[PDB]
């Protein structure tokens, strides 16, 4: 993967041209197409900044890495990591959202009549969404577990962010109790 092909000039040419089709389309940066984030990607990240105003590295995959969006957003970071290891250059992720402009929304809404995360139309619609969050959560648990072992054996760099994040879930303490709701309905159904 230390042998690849890329045309740098092309990035510059494209920037000017996209402006005519829409004003909202200018050189933001570059896209990577999975499967992981590699060392080999770091060489291109450097280069992109000069060409673009400062660039972003978004990784758009063909299949989700979770259950939601197939996109990750990254910014290059330098951080000191200690376990017998020196300062590391890594890519620190920042969370992503969905969103669109009015033109896009119009076509997707008429075309959609699929099942979705939830459509909303019944109580039962809502359970499908509840099933999907819980299944998602299962996925993340597997990735972290296999990694914890790899840190212990190899002495892989310990990123402060991961150890702190997992810790927090454990400390908050779950507590849950009393819940109720109405029961007005019977007279109404009986009424019909």
């Amino acid at each position: 993967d230390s042998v690849w092909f890329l045309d740098h000039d092309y990035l510059e040419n494209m920037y000017g041209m996209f402006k005519k089709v829409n004003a909202r389309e200018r050189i933001v940066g570059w896209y990577h197409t999975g499967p992981k984030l590699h060392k080999n990607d770091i060489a291109i990240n450097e280069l992109m900044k000069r060409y673009c105003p400062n660039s972003v590295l978004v990784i758009i995959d063909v299949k989700p890495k979770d259950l939601g969006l197939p996109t990750e957003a990254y910014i290059s970071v330098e951080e000191v990591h200690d376990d017998g290891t020196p300062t590391s250059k890594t890519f620190e992720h920042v969370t992503s959202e969905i969103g669109a402009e009015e033109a896009e929304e119009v076509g997707v809404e008429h075309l959609l009549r699929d099942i979705k995360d939830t459509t909303v139309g019944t109580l039962s619609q809502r359970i499908t969404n509840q099933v999907h969050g819980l299944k998602g959560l299962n996925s993340k648990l597997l990735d972290i577990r296999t990694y914890l072992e790899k840190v212990a054996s190899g002495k892989l760099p310990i990123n402060h962010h991961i150890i702190y994040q997992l810790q927090d879930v454990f400390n908050l303490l779950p507590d849950a109790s009393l819940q109720e709701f109405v029961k007005a309905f019977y007279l109404k159904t009986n009424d019909q």
Binding site: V62, G68, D117, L123, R126, G136, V169, E180, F181
Partner: protein, 155 residues
């Protein structure tokens, strides 16, 4: 209000290219505005069809699977907020309840909606009452299901 069209020149009209276009597909004529359809048809164009093919991968990306979107389903809302809502919801039913007591006295013929309007209560007083409980029941029911599950799982 998207049509595919084809140019009508002097040459094209003499050949009879315009019927020739309808052939080989499902056929399509435009609609928007009366002045634009007559004028357009003669001078400007002949109209022909657009149909759409989008693959299952295209549909999957179209859908916008989203991580927080599913997560909300589990996310527990305040207990006081459910109690507060339960009480608020009851207050809408109270209003409807005056109309509803009168409507119910006589509903001895056919069509519930006519009976309900006739013995006072615009459209269906029963319906209004039912929608009001359903929204509250829906939020409370899912949150209780979620709460018991999370507490046990995390612990």
């Amino acid at each position: 209000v998207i049509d595919a069209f084809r140019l009508i020149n002097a040459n094209m009209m003499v050949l009879g290219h315009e019927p020739r276009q309808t052939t080989s597909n499902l056929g399509h004529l435009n609609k928007p505005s009366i002045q634009a359809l007559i004028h357009g048809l003669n001078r400007h164009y002949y109209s022909i069809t657009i149909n759409y093919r989008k693959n299952e991968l295209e549909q999957k990306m179209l859908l916008n699977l989203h991580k927080k979107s599913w997560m909300e389903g589990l996310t527990l809302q305040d207990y006081s907020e459910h109690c507060k809502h339960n009480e608020s919801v009851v207050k809408e039913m109270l209003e409807l309840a005056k109309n509803y007591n009168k409507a119910v006295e006589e509903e001895d013929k056919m069509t519930p909606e006519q009976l309900a309007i006739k013995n006072v209560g615009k459209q269906d007083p029963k319906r209004h009452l039912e929608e009001h409980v359903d929204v509250l029941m829906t939020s409370n029911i899912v949150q209780c299901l979620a709460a018991m599950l999370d507490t046990v799982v995390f612990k």
